Amino acid sequence: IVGGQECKDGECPWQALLINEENEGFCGGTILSEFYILTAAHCLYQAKRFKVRVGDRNTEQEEGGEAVHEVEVVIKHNRFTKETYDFDIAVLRLKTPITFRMNVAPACLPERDWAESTLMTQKTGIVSGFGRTHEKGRQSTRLKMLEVPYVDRNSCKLSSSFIITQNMFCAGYDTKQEDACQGDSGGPHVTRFKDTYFVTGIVSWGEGCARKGKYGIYTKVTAFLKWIDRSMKT
Amino acid sequence: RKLCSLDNGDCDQFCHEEQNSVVCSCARGYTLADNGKACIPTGPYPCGKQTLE
Ligand SMILES: CN1CCN(C(=O)[C@H](CNC(=O)c2ccc(Cl)s2)NS(=O)(=O)c2cc(F)cc(N3CCCCC3=O)c2Cl)CC1
Ligand SMILES: [Ca+2]
Fold first, then answer.
1. A123 and A94 in a common domain
2. Measured between CB atoms, which of B4, B5, B50 is closest to A11?
3. In chain A, where does DSSP find H-type helix?
4. Domain assignments of chain B as residue spans, ordered by start
5. How close is the nearest chain B Cα to the Cα of A49, in Å?
6. In this structure, what CATH number is given to the domain that contains residue A135?
7. Testing the interface with B: which of A196, A222, A225 to mutate, by most B Cβ within 10 A?
8. Cβ of B52: how many Cβ atoms within 10 Å?
């Protein structure tokens, strides 16, 4: 996260972190239930083997909310193409259940018709992660959040040097140097309604980070709600 | 605005206009109250709520 605020105790409990073979986190995630984690599809080609850590706020210091889980069944969208990043969605079924607590909680999956009319018409959303603090920078040792406004789809298409598909949406600022970045990838974009946070987006991509006239591109989770629902059985 | 468009039909969470009349539903880990509008947590740490506890 370039700029923004840091997640205090219990503020971003749905945040998951995918850690490679050398203990280091490479991607973000979202807790959907005690067995399931939501992430971007492109995170699967980052490393050959990974696990999921929950309740982390500091990569250096062991927190006490930290717990590591092994991924059992990896489910990727069979239409994900890495040339357009279309269908950038993946589901991770864990071997052992997640204990919900301080810093560890799931995020609600919304209903398709309601979210489009209610959550998508809200002013802002919240993105969080352990990503880069600058475009050229390094991973953040601390968990950070940012209030990202929903960007009009018409302006979203005109700013992008790449295709914006139906399964994507724009969020962020025009010039204000605040955005998500590399490492935040696959992390949570949640929207608040009556002090309850619902999953709306997955951190997918952006032309660099915090560039003027560019926005954060997020996987439109609402276009995949039936697909995720099917996954959360076996 | 009308119904679900006007103040979410007075639902805590999901709203759908089921025969003009508003019918509310809740996310997993919640249960619908007797008023049919509120969402009540099943246990500790339900989805969506910040765990300041
Ligand atoms: C593998 N990983 C590399 C880093 N990455 C990027 O999008 C980078 C840095 N920016 C970001 O990660 C984000 C910025 C804003 C949000 Cl939200 S995520 N922007 S980038 O220009 O360096 C970049 C890297 C990359 F690997 C892929 C792409 N894209 C963008 C979509 C079109 C095809 C493509 O390869 C792009 Cl634009 C996500 C994917
Ligand atoms: Ca820690």
1. no
2. B50
3. 112-118, 153-159, 225-231
4. 1-53
5. 29
6. 2.40.10.10
7. A196
8. 10
